[PDB]
Paper text:
In addition to Alrs, a PLP-dependent racemase is found to possess a broad amino-acid specificity (broad specificity amino acid racemase, Bar, E.C. 5.1.1.10). Notably, Lyr is also active against arginine, whereas Bar racemizes arginine, lysine, methionine, serine, cysteine, leucine, and histidine, a useful feature for biotechnological applications. To further develop lyr- or bar-based marker genes with desired properties, we determined the three-dimensional structures of P. putida DSM84 Bar and P. mirabilis Lyr, which are the first structures for lysine-preferred racemases. All structures contain PLP, which confirms their PLP-dependent nature, and the positions of their catalytic lysines and tyrosines are similar to those in Alr structures.
Expression and biochemical characterization of recombinant Lyr has shown that its preferred substrate is lysine. We next solved the Lyr structure by molecular replacement with the Bar structure as the template. One Lyr molecule is found in the asymmetric unit. With the exception of those for the first 36 residues, the positions of all main-chain and side-chain atoms are well defined. Two Lyr molecules associate to form a dimer related by a two-fold crystallographic axis. The tertiary structures of the Lyr and Bar protomers are similar (RMSD = 0.89 Å for Cα positions). The apo Lyr structure has also been established within the internal aldimine linkage. Given the relatively larger space between Thr391 and PLP in Lyr, and Ala393 and PLP in Bar as compared with those in the Alrs, a substrate larger than an alanine may better fit the space. Mutation of the inner-layer Thr391 of Lyr to tyrosine, which is positioned similarly to the conserved tyrosines in Alrs (Tyr354 in BsAlr), reduced the activity of Lyr towards L-Lys to 53%.
Numbering used by the authors:
A (entry chain A), B (entry chain A): 37 to 407
The structure:
Amino acid sequence: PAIVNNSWIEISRSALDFNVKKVQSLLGKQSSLCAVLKGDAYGHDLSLVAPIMIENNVKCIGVTNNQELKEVRDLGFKGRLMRVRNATEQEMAQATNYNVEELIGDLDMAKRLDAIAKQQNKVIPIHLALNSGGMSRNGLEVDNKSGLEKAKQISQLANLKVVGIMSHYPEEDANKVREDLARFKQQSQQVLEVMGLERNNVTLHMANTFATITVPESWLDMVRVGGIFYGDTIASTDYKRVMTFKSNIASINYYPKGNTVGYDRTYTLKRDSVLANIPVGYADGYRRVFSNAGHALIAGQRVPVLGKTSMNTVIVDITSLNNIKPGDEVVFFGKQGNSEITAEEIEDISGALFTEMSILWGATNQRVLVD
Amino acid sequence: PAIVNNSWIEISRSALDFNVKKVQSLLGKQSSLCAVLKGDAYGHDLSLVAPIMIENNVKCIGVTNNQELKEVRDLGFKGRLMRVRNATEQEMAQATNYNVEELIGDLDMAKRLDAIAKQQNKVIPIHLALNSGGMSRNGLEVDNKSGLEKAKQISQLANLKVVGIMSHYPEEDANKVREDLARFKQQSQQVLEVMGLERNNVTLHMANTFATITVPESWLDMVRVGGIFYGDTIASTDYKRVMTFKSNIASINYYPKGNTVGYDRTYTLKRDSVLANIPVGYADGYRRVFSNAGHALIAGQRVPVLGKTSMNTVIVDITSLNNIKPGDEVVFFGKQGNSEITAEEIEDISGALFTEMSILWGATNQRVLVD
């Protein structure tokens, strides 16, 4: 007996499959695809999304946590499995269990990983992260002779193998991309030289979703793409959205003009009203940011959230609809009839990119594969 | 082999136990305690918190979702189990499996629940929610003769039993509490009268954490308290915080003056710098709201988050510390040495109450029972 969900997120298998096939088609036999499925596949559920990558013969996947790395192996993925962030010794020592290529951007961390590999009688594959793009996040600054000297020392560690060299773009702007690209191509060249590595045995990779779509020169040996799979990109509208966030009406309540709604009485009814009580609140990631601001879809029509969101309940005004029934389907993101809640309005209310919302919705609501 | 966590939330068993015992001591033999453990025990993990209630002989618990209701029964709770929101037919029909007292504030929903009880050959217990407090959320308006008539009709439904009558305060202000209290005491009286119910067979309850601490006259037959268990209340500082949110340093990176940090290069280094890369980001609920705003604790000292949070990584400035090592413990909420990150600064950065943060952190990071 499946437990009944207060709310749920539909994950369109056909949309994902479409998107995977489309990127694959765009690259062709150029470069190669690394599917970046961090953040629990950006809220879409690593359990749901990874098998779909595996069925499309994707050969490389990037995640961040040991849990994710374990899960991806458990789902039968056999190929190249990368961690797309710097990780701790504790993390990396356990993660040899899953044959992961780690991301190293500092010599001390390279020495510490090399000590772990010596301790386990292994040679551990790494991607050397450079700060060519300028993130000053995961990557080694190799702006000069002494940064290059650090890279040379990393190449002398007998129990690492450098299988890749990478950077990452700070700004989704085609021209800033082209600049950082030229800088990476120049720096990675010197790095290969000081490290004694053959360009043909080392995967060069810099591009993310925006670069992959916008700046074909970026593709290099491999692209690292994420948001592309969920139509989440400022660079195209041809990749399909994958999530639809739904619930149902728990009660339909009649209240007089003059009544107020919600904590601190922040919305006053201007008319006798009919209010839908929906069991979604901020514990479902429907945050306080939506208070007197959000909209939902009911009967194919956009209706407003009234007052402050509660932890587990939101109230929407249905006074202008009719023939609405308890149990009627409500949509908080996605399509219903000829209405839609868009990513863009979610960003504007929330004050942050949509990917943060999809991740936080995905963490707080059951995902169900559809289509 | 336990999977290594990128980050984790310590849940102090001793703090919770302290808080439970303290409320219990405050009420004594007056009223009674309903522990409200919705929102996954406000982010503290229903799996961890419920057994602690059960060991303290708590006799009544309130949650919201069927999953939670199932879990609380599965953990061996035998007592009075309430749903503290309006719920759908789908939800309520399944939830007889767990012997739940539902929350009904409309006659149609009362009729629909009564139809479900007739369909299952049961008499289903309910709490009749009134809108005395003014939420216009879960509760019946019984301001007059015709609202009272709806309550009379609810009392004529042969397959519900009214075991309780309740309201809820919109405003944590002692005087507004006292007002709403007088209104509830007056309305619930008429309601008992029109419904043919004996006051002695029906639990009256209105108080939440703030009312329970601030306005002793509120306690009535039962209090419904939540945030009290986690020291989460504007009404006292004597209840202990329960959560500590931790991670560790993944890499320590040296970068020149003039370098920038993070997406869109929003922070420029003013000096040669030493930066700690920590594997916590917005996928761990460390939202973009913390960009160039947050602080962490390292070596017992408060240090700033630099640039925009990434999905899985935050960078903090450690240039002013020394002898810092990879794997060193980092604290994002709670105490370390003689430094602290407080609930109040989390609210100010986030723009919302702390409970939303604790819930969203709890949804995106492993909880580990300590003490």
